[PDB]
C-alpha cells in the first residue's frame, strides 16, 4: 500500500472523480513542494516532475486545453526540465526550474503571466527575464498577481497593482517582472488575494495592497501609503514567516503567531466572537505551542507544529480544514487535526475551497 514516505491527502473540493478517496502517492518518487490556488493545486516531486489538478477553466493547469481534469496530471511539456518550485494564484500557475527558466500558464487579465501581454495561455510559457543568474528561493501568486524571490534576497513582482498589491507605487499593472526593493534582502514572500507581504533577513515585516478589512495590520494614518511596502512596527519580535489570505494575514515570529484582518469564518483563530482586528493580535490559545510553518487559504489557516502536528481554523465548508469527514463547521480557534495524530505532517498548502497535505505515518 502507501510507501513509508507517506501520501498526499486532499481535503475539500479537489475536483477528483468518485471515488477517488482523496489520497495518493508516486511510484519511486516523493512530494517535495505543494501549492494551492483558488480552485487548483500543484505538486512538485523529488524527481523534479510537476503534477497539476483541480480547476482548468483558465488553462491554469498548463495541459494544453481548458477541459475538465479529475485526477493528478503530469505536465508532459516540462519533462525535459527539472521542476523545483510552483505557485498557484487565483487562475494562474508559476513554475521555476533548476536550469534557470521560470514558466507561467493560465489567466492573464492583468499581466500576471509575465509574458508582456494580457492574453490567457493553456500551456506553460517561459518568462524571458529569468535566467540561471536568478536562483529562485520562493514563488508566490495571488489574484492576478505574481512574485519570485531569489536566494540572495531580490524580490520581483508582476500583474495587478490596482490596489498597490505588488508594491509598484503609481503603476496600475505590469505584464513583465519588476523589482520591488526597500534596500534590504528579502527572506519570505506571500501574495494574498488583494494584498502582499514580505519578510526581510533582519526580521522585519512589510505589507502593501488593499487597505481594507484591517488585513495590512497598519494604523489608520499609514493606510494612505498602501501602494508602497510599509513596516509593521506593532510586532516587536523578529518575523520569520508571513502568509496572506483572502482578507486576512498570518505572521510567524520566534515567540508567537499573529493574525489580523477579517475573521468572520474563524480564520483569525482568536476566539468564537472576535470577528476582525486592524492591528496584529497574538493567538493566545497556542502561546505555549511552537509553530514551524504557517499556511493561508482564502478563508482558512493551517499551522504545522514543532513536531509535525497540524492545527487548522477558519471556514469548514466541504471539509477543507481536514478535521472530520462529517464535520463542516467553522472553527474560531486553532483545532488539532487528530486524524493526523499518528502522522508527521511534512507539507501543507491551502487554497480557496481545498487543502493539500503531505504526511507520513509513524
Amino acid at each position: 500500500l502507501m510507501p513509508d514516505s507517506g501520501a498526499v491527502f486532499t481535503f475539500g473540493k479537489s475536483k477528483f472523480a468518485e471515488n477517488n478517496p482523496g489520497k495518493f502517492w508516486f511510484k519511486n518518487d516523493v512530494p517535495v513542494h505543494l501549492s494551492c490556488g483558488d480552485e487548483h493545486s500543484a505538486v512538485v516531486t523529488g524527481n523534479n516532475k510537476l503534477y497539476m489538478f483541480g480547476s482548468n477553466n483558465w488553462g491554469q493547469l498548463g495541459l494544453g486545453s481548458k477541459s475538465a481534469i479529475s485526477k493528478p496530471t503530469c505536465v508532459k511539456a516540462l519533462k525535459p526540465e527539472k521542476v523545483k518550485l510552483a505557485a498557484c494564484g487565483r487562475n494562474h500557475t508559476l513554475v521555476s526550474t533548476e536550469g534557470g527558466n521560470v514558466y507561467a500558464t493560465g489567466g492573464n487579465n492583468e499581466g500576471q503571466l509575465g509574458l508582456g501581454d494580457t492574453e490567457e495561455r493553456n500551456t506553460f510559457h517561459v518568462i524571458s527575464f529569468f535566467t540561471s543568474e536568478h536562483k529562485i528561493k520562493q514563488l508566490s501568486a495571488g489574484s492576478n498577481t505574481s512574485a519570485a524571490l531569489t536566494e540572495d534576497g531580490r524580490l520581483f513582482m508582476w500583474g495587478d497593482n490596482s490596489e498597490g498589491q505588488i508594491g509598484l507605487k503609481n503603476v496600475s499593472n505590469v505584464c513583465v517582472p519588476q523589482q520591488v526593493t526597500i534596500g534590504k534582502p528579502v527572506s519570505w514572500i506571500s501574495c494574498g488575494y488583494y494584498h502582499s507581504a514580505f519578510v526581510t533577513t533582519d526580521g522585519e515585516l512589510y505589507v502593501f495592497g488593499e487597505p481594507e478589512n484591517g488585513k495590512l495590520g497598519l494604523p489608520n494614518q499609514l493606510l494612505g501609503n498602501h501602494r508602497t511596502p510599509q513596516l509593521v512596527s506593532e510586532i516587536p519580535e523578529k518575523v520569520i514567516q508571513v502568509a496572506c489570505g483572502g482578507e486576512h494575514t498570518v505572521v510567524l515570529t520566534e515567540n508567537a503567531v499573529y493574525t489580523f484582518g477579517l475573521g468572520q469564518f474563524g480564520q483569525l483563530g482568536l476566539g468564537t466572537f472576535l470577528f476582525e482586528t486592524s492591528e496584529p493580535k497574538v493567538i493566545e490559545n497556542i502561546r505555549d505551542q511552537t509553530i514551524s510553518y504557517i499556511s493561508c487559504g482564502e478563508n482558512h489557516t493551517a499551522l504545522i507544529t514543532d513536531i509535525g502536528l497540524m492545527y487548522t481554523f477558519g471556514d469548514g465548508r466541504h471539509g477543507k480544514l481536514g478535521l472530520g469527514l462529517e464535520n463542516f463547521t467553522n472553527h474560531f480557534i486553532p483545532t488539532l487535526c487528530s486524524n493526523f495524530l499518528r502522522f508527521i505532517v511534512k507539507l501543507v498548502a491551502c487554497g480557496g475551497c481545498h487543502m493539500v497535505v503531505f504526511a507520513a505515518p509513524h
Partner: protein, 142 residues
C-alpha cells in the same frame, strides 16, 4: 406536458458560460460545468469586484436536440432566503439539434464578506409556459 419537459431536458446541455465586464470586455468568470442540471446544488466563485460593475455581460452556450418555441429563463437572486432581484431573459425559437451562444446584459450594495456563500441564483428553464427545470447556483464572492 410532463413527457415533453423531460424530452427537452434530456437533450439540453449547457456547454459553457462566461461573465464579462460590459465596459472593458474582460472576462471576470468562465466555466465549463453544466450549471443547468436540476437537483444538484452547483457553486460558482466570482471576483468580489463584480459587485462594483455597472453592467455584466453574460454569454451562455447551449445545445438542444429538441425544438423549442420560446426558450426563456426566470432567475431569482436570493440572499439568506430573501429575494433581492428577479430577472427575465428570452432567447426565443430553438432550432432542433443546434448549438447557440446567447448573450445577455445584466445591470446592477451589500459587502462581499456577507454575500459570499449566502447568495443563491434560482433559474427556471421555460419553453413558453412549460416549466422544463429549476436549477440553483450558490455564489461565492472572493
Amino acid at each position: 406536458k410532463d413527457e415533453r419537459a423531460r424530452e427537452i431536458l434530456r437533450g439540453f446541455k449547457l456547454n459553457w458560460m462566461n461573465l464579462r465586464d460590459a465596459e472593458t470586455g474582460k472576462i471576470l468568470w468562465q466555466g465549463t460545468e453544466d450549471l443547468s442540471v436540476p437537483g444538484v446544488e452547483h457553486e460558482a466563485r466570482v471576483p468580489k469586484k463584480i459587485l462594483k460593475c455597472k453592467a455584466v455581460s453574460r454569454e451562455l452556450n447551449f445545445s438542444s436536440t429538441e425544438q423549442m418555441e420560446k426558450f426563456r429563463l426566470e432567475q431569482k437572486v436570493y440572499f439568506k432566503g430573501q429575494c433581492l432581484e428577479e430577472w427575465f431573459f428570452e432567447f426565443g425559437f430553438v432550432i432542433p439539434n443546434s448549438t447557440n451562444t446567447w448573450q445577455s446584459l445584466i445591470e446592477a450594495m451589500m459587502p462581499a464578506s456577507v454575500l459570499t456563500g449566502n447568495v443563491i441564483i434560482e433559474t427556471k428553464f421555460f419553453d413558453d409556459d412549460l416549466l422544463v427545470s429549476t436549477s440553483r447556483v450558490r455564489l461565492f464572492y472572493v
